Amino acid sequence: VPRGSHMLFQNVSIAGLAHIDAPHTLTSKEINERLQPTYDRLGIKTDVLGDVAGIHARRLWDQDVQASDAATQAARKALIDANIGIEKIGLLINTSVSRDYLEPSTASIVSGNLGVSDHCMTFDVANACLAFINGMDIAARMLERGEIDYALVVDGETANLVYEKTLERMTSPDVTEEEFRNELAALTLGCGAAAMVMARSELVPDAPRYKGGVTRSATEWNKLCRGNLDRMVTDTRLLLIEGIKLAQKTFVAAKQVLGWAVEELDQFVIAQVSRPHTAAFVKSFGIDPAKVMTIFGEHGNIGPASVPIVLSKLKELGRLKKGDRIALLGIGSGLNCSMAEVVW
């Protein structure tokens, strides 16, 4: 029975991939020592970072590293992984939450640093922790159509400022319990970067394939998590509850469009917000936890870079074999939920 493609991408591959770990460790122990007076004044007796959120450390850059610098570093590594020169790139998309300026795009700055050709189209996409996927899909539409041969999708995240200013606010003798709770999730963020080189499959015939997938939304919840360059306020309770409801709806769509059944997928690459969000997601869907690599423990929540960083760490661990079906998924502020498939 002749079936249609379900609008999945055809002849689009992942030519290269890389991640950068930020160099400075900040432990939750050290954070907790700074917060201890406030914890005592608020009556907080559990370790809300290490024990409740499940974060033991995160990584930070130096204060002068901008999002563009981190993205560039990752892009140069991905080009080496793809064994291609910058001249072959026709499209460069920056997906980070962090951004050097309102104008010009962070993509232009990355592009200028790498020395892209004058044929290279560049722009930024922003969509909280799902944006890397969105950039992949935008590049995949161009590649599938044959307008370009190779595309870079890049993401550098800098959380230094938010940590500095949140820890100041959260150690004020007058911070309120409500304000403290509202800002706490900012101390689960981390720094890092990732980049991916995408290609027409005819150019890279043994490379992994990207199929695309599905998106659903619940934009009546767009107030749940709000952030600027120095502050993020997050209703983590409704993020979890509404996020999982959204995900259940997007998984029904994934069964229809991608044919998914959880038990047939080999790895689930999840944008991870915290350990209880992750456990909840896995239990709700019956996912086998041995298929879910976590880096949140030691790196925290790297935003839209989380997914490609985890995919890059899987690659480097030798955990991915030819033919493995890899689910990329996440719930991002908005709310949005995206689920897509890579076949290694």
Add this chain to the structure above:
Amino acid sequence: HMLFQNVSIAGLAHIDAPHTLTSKEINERLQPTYDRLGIKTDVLGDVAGIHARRLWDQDVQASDAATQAARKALIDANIGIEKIGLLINTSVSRDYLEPSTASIVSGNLGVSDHCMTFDVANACLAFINGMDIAARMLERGEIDYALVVDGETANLVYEKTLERMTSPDVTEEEFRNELAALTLGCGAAAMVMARSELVPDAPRYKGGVTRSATEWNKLCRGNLDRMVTDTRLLLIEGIKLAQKTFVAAKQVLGWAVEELDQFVIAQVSRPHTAAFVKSFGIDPAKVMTIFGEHGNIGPASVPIVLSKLKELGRLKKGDRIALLGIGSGLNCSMAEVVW
């Protein structure tokens, strides 16, 4: 090589912001400082050519302005929100880093659980990028209708830039580049795009081309509170890039200057526009301008000008319309609509 053949423009709208700030009024507030610094050219009015701009009410966010435009564009398209499968926000101004301004507009409008939303940023070219992005989804059959929205707010830029410039320590160099921020304006626009089989008499979007000169990413650096630009150098290199883009547009779209009925250009200033027109040998009558009364509305300029052309009755069936701009980066994009 193969242009879009089933992507149409179903509806379009713009919103003018309601408060006027004239450049004469700006000049009077700055006079003590112009004198104290020995300035005697009226840079805004005589050199840039910006005689007024519009400002929102206080507390209008980018998302609010975009929402207002989107509602009008849906009426112009005669469709309700439930048909929209994609909503892209393309503005420079943004409410937050997270979530997308798109999600906030989408939430205000009540889009369905099928609607995909995200923001695109690319200085004054982003609307054109957003339209291209949306075209590619339409052509593949992912969606039937898309909204591309852009609300721009400059109230803060003015409050701060004028407060700074009139403090007594302000040097002439600080003063000088703070002037470029005083060319910005408020406004908003939106466009409904659609699969042509659904709207067969509607204008068609063909696509276009882009070329870049990202060696100059330094030249125009814009935050919520400030805009620092190198205006002279931006202009020259901008034109060189445009000329290269036009060569590409000959090859992929068949462009010749004399065969285009309108040029809808991202609008920066009078010298910028006049240099563009002179370089290409374009008939100025084919180049509608709004900066004299609205200033630079960034990426919303392109759809606002197209919307004005439409509501003034200036566009006839079969007109070939060039949409184009030179954006910070530097980037240059040129695309075609056939009305």
